Design an enzyme around this catalytic site. Structure first.
Site, mmCIF file in Angstrom:
data_model
loop_
_atom_site.group_PDB
_atom_site.id
_atom_site.type_symbol
_atom_site.label_atom_id
_atom_site.label_comp_id
_atom_site.label_asym_id
_atom_site.label_seq_id
_atom_site.Cartn_x
_atom_site.Cartn_y
_atom_site.Cartn_z
ATOM 1 C CG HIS A 89 -1.800 -1.051 0.763
ATOM 2 N ND1 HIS A 89 -2.238 -1.274 2.105
ATOM 3 C CD2 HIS A 89 -2.931 -0.957 0.079
ATOM 4 C CE1 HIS A 89 -3.533 -2.769 2.283
ATOM 5 N NE2 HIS A 89 -3.566 -2.108 0.605
ATOM 6 C CB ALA A 90 1.309 3.447 -2.899
ATOM 7 N NE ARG A 106 -10.765 -4.818 0.394
ATOM 8 C CZ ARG A 106 -10.572 -3.948 1.256
ATOM 9 N NH1 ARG A 106 -9.013 -2.865 1.299
ATOM 10 N NH2 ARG A 106 -10.597 -3.905 2.910
ATOM 11 C CD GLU A 121 -1.825 -3.407 8.709
ATOM 12 O OE1 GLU A 121 -1.095 -1.962 8.959
ATOM 13 O OE2 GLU A 121 -2.685 -3.606 8.346
HETATM 14 N N1 LIG Z 1 -6.421 -9.867 3.898
HETATM 15 C C1 LIG Z 1 -6.445 -9.087 5.345
HETATM 16 N N2 LIG Z 1 -5.256 -8.830 6.268
HETATM 17 N N3 LIG Z 1 -7.439 -7.877 5.296
HETATM 18 C C2 LIG Z 1 -7.526 -6.659 5.326
HETATM 19 C C3 LIG Z 1 -8.554 -7.202 6.704
HETATM 20 C C4 LIG Z 1 -8.515 -5.938 7.422
HETATM 21 C C5 LIG Z 1 -7.855 -4.581 7.261
HETATM 22 C C6 LIG Z 1 -6.890 -4.698 5.862
HETATM 23 C C7 LIG Z 1 -6.367 -3.640 5.392
HETATM 24 C C8 LIG Z 1 -5.774 -2.579 6.472
HETATM 25 P P1 LIG Z 1 -4.261 -1.177 5.874
HETATM 26 O O1 LIG Z 1 -3.200 -1.972 5.453
HETATM 27 O O2 LIG Z 1 -5.053 -0.131 4.962
HETATM 28 C C9 LIG Z 1 -4.437 -0.076 7.294
HETATM 29 C C10 LIG Z 1 -5.228 0.561 8.166
HETATM 30 C C11 LIG Z 1 -5.008 1.765 8.876
HETATM 31 C C12 LIG Z 1 -6.090 2.279 9.879
HETATM 32 C C13 LIG Z 1 -6.849 1.905 10.625
HETATM 33 C C14 LIG Z 1 -8.120 2.864 11.250
HETATM 34 C C15 LIG Z 1 -8.696 3.186 10.663
HETATM 35 C C16 LIG Z 1 -8.068 4.118 9.015
HETATM 36 C C17 LIG Z 1 -6.790 3.595 8.381
HETATM 37 C C18 LIG Z 1 -7.510 -2.595 4.822
HETATM 38 O O3 LIG Z 1 -8.247 -2.213 5.305
HETATM 39 O O4 LIG Z 1 -7.156 -2.691 3.680
HETATM 40 C C19 LIG Z 1 -6.221 -5.629 5.470
HETATM 41 ZN ZN LIG Z 2 -1.963 -1.581 4.096
#
Ligand SMILES: N=C(N)Nc1cccc([C@H](CP(=O)(O)CCCc2ccccc2)C(=O)O)c1
Ligand SMILES: [Zn+2]
Length: 305
Positions: free
Chosen positions: A65-66, A141, A267
């Site tokens: 993620h950039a 995704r 994270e």
């Molecule tokens: N396969 C996975 N790990 N999927 C996944 C599940 C939950 C979150 C995520 C990511 C999290 P991310 O890497 O962008 C970091 C998000 C940080 C954040 C946290 C709270 C509010 C706003 C932003 C997403 O939202 O795409 C991936």
């Molecule tokens: Zn990310």
């Protein structure tokens, strides 16, 4: 232009660094490219370790993620720490003797360049989409894990667009291709993101739990305890779906369903005070504490093969 381990470096600088660190450490690092990006940048992979026959490996990527700049910084930090401490610190010395680390410094190079030039908060790739002027797919995704079924959009204009098809992105296809071609040796998959201070394991695309969830929970628990020893930084951990929220198409879930039984999303700092715009002044402390968790996981994996 000059590279620093306590600053965020642009792609031109990171690219020059992959060549330099490899030339300076020939018996510890080899560099290849696993593909090109949509805009023609080279997706470098560093193989870090003492070469030998039939070595197991751990795979770690950064910069899915950039805008998550501390992620890119960590992969670079890791590489120097490996080469600086080999031969002096018992654990890292054993790690590099017995296994190889595949370190992918930046997966989504095109988006990273965009965050340096136009939009600091960009996250997706920069590929074009049919029938619209909207740009980019969310590479996390875009994998074939319950693809686009939950926590994802089918609209190219959204930040969570899952892509036209699984592995539609040259970058994600390149990564999946590499992992598929190296399944026999890759024993763990680590993918570095920010922010939120969590260690996630499968699944995110569904609420079901992985066969080995008790083991993964104990390992995550131990890793966050190790991380906290340095500066008291608190991480939470668990299956992605309940620990953050459901989201399909992620590389950690896909890698796990390929048979890589130790698959984690990290994270990193912080918890939202600065968010994605983590000051350079926190690069050292963040990287140092994260190193402890990564090494703890590595030692565990090595003792369990
Ligand atoms: N396969 C996975 N790990 N999927 C996944 C599940 C939950 C979150 C995520 C990511 C999290 P991310 O890497 O962008 C970091 C998000 C940080 C954040 C946290 C709270 C509010 C706003 C932003 C997403 O939202 O795409 C991936
Ligand atoms: Zn990310």
């Amino acid at each position: 232009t000059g590279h620093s381990y306590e600053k965020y470096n642009n792609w031109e600088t990171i690219e020059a660094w992959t060549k330099q660190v490899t030339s300076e450490n020939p018996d510890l690092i080899s560099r290849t490219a696993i593909g090109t990006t949509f805009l023609g940048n080279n997706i470098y992979l560093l193989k870090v370790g003492k070469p030998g026959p039939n070595k197991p490996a751990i795979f770690m990527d950064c910069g899915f993620h950039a805008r998550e700049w501390i992620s890119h910084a960590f992969c670079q930090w890791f590489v120097r720490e490996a080469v600086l401490t080999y031969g002096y610190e018992s654990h890292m010395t054993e790690f590099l003797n017995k296994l190889d680390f595949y370190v992918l410094p930046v997966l989504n190079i095109d988006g990273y360049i965009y965050t340096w030039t136009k939009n600091r908060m960009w996250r997706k790739t920069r590929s074009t989409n049919a029938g619209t002027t909207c740009i980019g797919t969310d590479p996390n995704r875009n994998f074939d894990a319950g693809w686009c079924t939950t926590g994802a959009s089918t609209d190219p204009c959204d930040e969570t667009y899952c892509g036209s098809a699984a592995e539609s992105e040259k970058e994600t296809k390149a990564l999946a291709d590499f992992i598929r071609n190296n399944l026999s040796s890759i024993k763990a998959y680590l993918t570095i993101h920010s922010y939120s201070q969590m260690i996630l394991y499968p699944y995110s695309y569904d609420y079901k739990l992985p066969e080995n969830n008790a083991e993964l929970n104990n390992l995550a628990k131990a890793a966050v305890k190790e991380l906290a020893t340095l500066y008291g930084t608190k991480y939470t951990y668990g299956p992605g779906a309940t620990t953050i929220y459901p989201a399909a198409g992620g590389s950690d879930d896909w890698a796990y369903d390929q048979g890589i039984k130790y698959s984690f999303t990290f994270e990193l700092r912080d918890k939202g005070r600065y968010g994605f715009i983590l000051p350079e002044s926190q690069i050292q402390a963040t990287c140092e504490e994260t190193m402890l968790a990564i090494k703890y996981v590595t030692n565990y994996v090595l003792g369990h093969l």
